[PDB]
Point group: D2
Chain length 291, copies 4
């Protein structure tokens, strides 16, 4: 299990300096892994990232969400294609890094839709994701679909919806990515979705209800972590948080980050690392007593 | 305290038939009050509502959310005017019903903004809401601003933000409307925002985390209702729920209701009435036990 | 699934009058079943209970806790015998009623021990419970061992302990009885012990953290009932509550009921029935939505 | 605010070696303060404790519970007197240490009673506690009554009961001591009792529902700490935990510690210190934003 940190804790700009900075800070906060927000994989400086990861002994993953121009759930084949092209480059970037996990909202745009999904849109999305998965698979990379709330997709809002989507595709390297922030809205509770997704669960984001400091909102982390313990989950567990104090040119607007929920990210990151690790220690003692 | 039900439990279409239907089913489910969604107050058949309510004994309130063309937080004063004219008609509708509560997202568009609020936009919102509140005042109508999550406004996402907004306007009939579904996202916990708003809290929505059946999501209703008890809240407590089974032409899309969270609204309504009353009974025993006779 | 009420809601004295009273009030409060506390099965007026139950339609079960003189976890075989004779009569009473569930703290004294269990004491408990279960078996009676907190036993404080106990005895009619009040103390959470016990779980008590009104304490009923849904539990679900207002000569003292948590048992019973059914309704909608037709 | 640790994490025997050991281990786990279980204040080696506290820069408090022989809620004046004598020595021990907080179940025996309290018993308890408080007061020591569950007293099971008890006594240095483990049973919720006891709240124990590792039971710490933040609580916050792995000759039997809930107390103590401190950090950010 890798304990990770999403890059937007540190910076919204991942040129060379931001890549080095984000990696250093992640390591200094005590994490094993940085998740790069790869909103534009075409301009991501792989050589710098590979160097910085080596210098600091850090593992890496990457996430993104698509947009209007790249929506693979569009009925417009050209838009679908732009999306597929973007996902393929993201996968290629991860291959060059020697990383193994790609994730995010890659089955639709990451946006507040104003109508429900279409049958033809959903078919396009599934076909495109299948092909991306296969390309990833030949490269040793796992692809995990992030279940997000109603205001960020109209396609996969629950773990059970994601399972059905995966069932159709039947790809060995396609998994599910759950995020406590999104679960806290859409799911019946914080254990059922973990039990249900069991072995398909390949990636986890730890976010508070308002995406600030862990333990300052309404997310039931105790139930969540106890359920992760029960299924023996051993994939990445990655802190994600957003404040108006650190802005990405698109992502922050897309996720509606209006509030200053923190200004000291060194404190935030260290706290989150301690929060997650100490939760996991607690869970380990429970599992130890089941002997 | 009135126990209320929002109209989208019953129908998405508030023509004459839908209005009578929502009133009847609301009463039959055990509620004291129906909340009409007044997305277009200009077309709402007030006389049918009056006669339905009189038939059934039932109290009414109304809520709406604004949209792009009617956004009173717009920098464009023509858009603000359009919004203000809409809010003013909503208020008039309520006056004609003899109702006393208007609420909702009436200080901005109810939408996912793509940039944060501007100073000019915020000043326009505040001035317009002030004028609407004054108008409401002389018609005996209380106006409460509903705090909602980051995806439905960029203006008032927390109770404390609403407090600061209210303090500047300083109007006696202006209050805060909290909704457990939105609190579940943006707030630090389910008690602090109640203790903070205290006497400014004038309206409450009871919604599960996914806006389905009460008790089937992750909202901490326990803490919430206990806090309501502590401040002695006596305002409306109104069930709200949305499913793809029952669709309003604009509201449902605006709120991102993609999923089929229920198909039996008779069952859903009856259950919500019971669920809310069973909580209220509980906290009544707690307050009783704080009595010095105990 | 029967929704049940424990007798100490209604009276502390189960003479003829108290028996009829508890049956009537239990039914009138909306329950399917009454649980008689059978602390002294030898004096219990079985024919009055039979005739009361027949009058009212109502199902019955029984529970007890043992005491020092009847402690089947004692190293002293004369004490174990006294206990076994008591349990055997409890079972006979239930047989005579045509009831099918016996439960409670029947594997030890229900008491605050001052030292941990011994090997000899544990072996005596197990052997006695085995014989009692076999006896029960041929009378069509299921026996479930209630897991309780450290202050009421030193033997079975967790579901997993009860599982290990059950595994050794390997009897088809022997099950586990969980009580949310006790789980709230000793267990890691409110779902794991349900998922672990699964098919061995045969009886459930619904009790608030302080054993008062449901929803007025800190028990996480949400998680609990959702777990019950997941394993498809269909056994008895029985409300239990104690107040100094209604006192049983020994039980109340044994359980440390010092406080006046309610005075109106009509209200309390009606509320508990509603509270439990409103939870069960909720989780039924969840299970319905896991159906492939959905 | 002092972050503290109860001595039974480390040892059940507080001779000189156990005193030094408990203090060292507490400091090494990262705490500010050790709480000595002063079940027998007459044989407590003050000189050793004072030395060990100085060597490690640690503050100290003391708690105890009374027993049958020393029950100040007895109707037997001789038993009441033995109890008062014991409490006075405990207070004297704290004075010699230069410590300022005495707490625990000092208004009755710490036991499962088999009958309710008596009017005459309660009067004896209140009078005795009043006198002990006055003696403490002349010595600069605060006295805090620990609210405990129905199986450990028949006198003070809720914060509100404790407030009423204090109301009668009207002593300036008499406060209330709340313990999450006991609240988790008896109280309506985890915030009301803090709001209600407000300025009378002078001491806090942090214990999980089963008194093992923090975060492995049912206690709602999030609500609890958020309420402590709201009232601006600045007294001791002290971890308490019990396992059959570490036994005190009386206390462990009195508290019904039948289970092995941990065996590595160095891990337990460090975890608890991190758990509490990181909770408090989270709360501070909430309070900071109320600006
Ligand atoms: Mn995420
Ligand atoms: Mn609402
Ligand atoms: Mn029970
Ligand atoms: Mn304590």
């Amino acid at each position: 299990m890798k304990i990770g940190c999403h890059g937007l804790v540190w910076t919204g700009h991942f040129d060379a300096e931001g890549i080095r900075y984000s990696v250093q800070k992640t390591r200094e906060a005590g994490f094993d892994l940085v998740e790069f927000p790869l909103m534009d994989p075409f301009s991501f400086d792989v050589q710098t990232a590979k160097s910085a990861l080596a210098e600091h002994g850090l593992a890496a993953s990457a996430s993104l969400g698509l947009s209007d121009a790249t929506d693979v759930s569009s009925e417009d084949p050209a838009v679908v294609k732009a999306g597929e092209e973007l996902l393929n480059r993201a996968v290629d970037v991860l291959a060059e890094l020697g990383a193994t996990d790609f994730c995010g909202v890659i089955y639709s745009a990451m946006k507040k839709y104003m109508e429900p999904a279409t049958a033809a849109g959903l078919a396009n999305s599934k076909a495109a994701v299948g092909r991306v998965a296969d390309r990833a698979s030949d490269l040793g990379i796992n692809v995990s679909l992030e279940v997000v709330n109603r205001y960020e997709t109209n396609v996969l809002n629950t773990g059970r919806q994601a399972l059905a989507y995966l069932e159709e595709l039947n790809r060995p390297n396609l998994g599910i990515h759950l995020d406590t922030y999104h679960m806290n809205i859409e799911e019946s509770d914080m254990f059922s979705p973990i039990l249900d997704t069991a072995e398909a669960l390949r990636y986890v984001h730890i976010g508070e209800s308002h995406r600030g400091y862990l333990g300052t909102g309404s997310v039931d982390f105790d139930t969540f972590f106890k359920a992760l313990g029960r299924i023996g989950y051993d994939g990445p567990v990655v802190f994600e948080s957003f404040s108006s104090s650190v802005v990405a040119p698109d992502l922050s607007r897309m996720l509606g980050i209006w509030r200053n929920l923190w200004a000291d990210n060194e404190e935030l990151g260290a706290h989150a690392n301690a929060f997650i690790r100490d939760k996991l220690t607690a869970i380990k003692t429970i599992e130890l007593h089941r002997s």
